A paper describes a structure:
In contrast, the phosphatase INPP5E, which is trafficked to the primary cilium, binds to [name] with a reported affinity of ∼10 nM and it was described as a “high-affinity cargo”.31 Characterization of the INPP5E:[name] interaction identified two residues that confer high-affinity binding to [name]: an isoleucine in the −1 position and a serine in the −3 position relative to the carboxymethylated prenylated C-terminal cysteine. To test if the INPP5E high-affinity [name]-binding motif can increase the [name] affinity for [name], we used a fluorescein-labeled 13-residue peptide of a mutant [name] HVR sequence, which incorporates the Ser-3/Ile-1 motif. To this end, we determined the crystal structure of the full-length [name] S3I1 mutant in complex with [name] at a 2.2 Å resolution. The crystal structure contains two copies of the [name]:[name] S3I1 mutant complex within the asymmetric unit, where each [name] molecule binds to [name] in the same conformation. In this experiment, recombinant MBP-tagged prenylated [name](G12D) S3I1 mutant showed less release in the presence of excess ARL2.GppNHp or ARL3.GppNHp compared to MBP-tagged prenylated [name](G12D) with a wild-type hypervariable region [hereafter named [name](G12D) WT]. Exhibiting a very slow off-rate, the [name] S3I1 variant enabled an SPR fragment screen to be performed against the complex.
[name] is a major anticancer drug target which requires membrane localization to activate downstream signal transduction. Phosphodiesterase 6δ ([name]) has a beta-sandwich immunoglobulin fold which contains a hydrophobic pocket capable of binding to the farnesyl group. [name] binds to and sequesters the lipid of cytoplasmic [name] and has been proposed to deliver GTPase to recycling endosomes, which is followed by release mediated by the small G-protein Arf-like 2 (ARL2), allowing [name] to be trafficked back to the plasma membrane. The resultant lipid modification increases the affinity of [name] proteins toward membranes, where it is required for signal transduction. Here, we present a novel strategy for targeting [name] by stabilizing its interaction with the prenyl-binding protein [name] and disrupting its localization.
Residue numbers in the entry: 2 to 28, 36 to 171, 179 to 185
The structure:
Amino acid sequence: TEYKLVVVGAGGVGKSALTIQLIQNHFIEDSYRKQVVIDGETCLLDILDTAGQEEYSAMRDQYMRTGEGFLCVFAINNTKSFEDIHHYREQIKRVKDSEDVPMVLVGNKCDLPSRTVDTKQAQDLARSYGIPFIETSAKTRQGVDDAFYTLVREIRKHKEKMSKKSSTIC
Ligand SMILES: Nc1nc2c(ncn2[C@@H]2O[C@H](COP(=O)(O)OP(=O)(O)O)[C@@H](O)[C@H]2O)c(=O)[nH]1
Ligand SMILES: *C/C=C(/C)CC/C=C(\C)CCC=C(C)C
C-alpha cells in the first residue's frame, strides 16, 4: 500500500534530520520511497521533506494537493515554530478544501535541556485539532518511527472511512 507523507514546519525544526533518521538510521534529496511493515501491513512510504520546496508557491500547492498525510513539526526550544503550526495546518486545509486531513503534531529536539514549549500546551493544541501529538529527537531517534507510523495509521483510518465491465464494439 502506498502512503504519501509530507513533513512541514519552520526552517530549523529538524524536518531533514527526522526524514534522514527514519530512512538512513543516523543523525540534498527532497523526496524518498522507503518500504516498511507497519502493524503487519507491507507499506511503501513516499516521504517529502519540504525544506527546499516550501519557498515555491506551485511546489507548496502541489505537495499539499498530492500529500495524503502531514507531519506538522515544531522544535520544543523555538516558540515561533510552535506558533507557525497553525499557519501550516490552515494552508493544508485550504489547498485540500477539507476539514479531515491526516496530520500528526510533532515536537522535535526533545533531547535538549532548554525547552520553551510546555508539553501541556502542545497536548492541548493536538486535542483542539483532534490529532495525535508525538515528542521526537532526530538526535537520539526517540519517537521517530512512532511519529511516521502514527501518520500512516491516520492515513489508513482516513481511507478506511473514505470507502462495471463494458463493451467498446456494442
Ligand atoms: N539536538 C537536536 N538537534 C537537532 C534535532 N533535529 C535537528 N537538529 C539540528 O537542528 C538543525 C536543523 O535541522 P534540519 O533537519 O536541517 O532542519 P529543517 O530546516 O527543519 O530540515 C540541524 O543543525 C540539526 O542537526 C534534534 O532532535 N535534536
Ligand atoms: C453487442 C452487439 C454486437 C455488435 C454483437 C452481437 C453479436 C453477434 C451478432 C454474434 C454473437 C454470436 C453468438 C451469440 C453465437
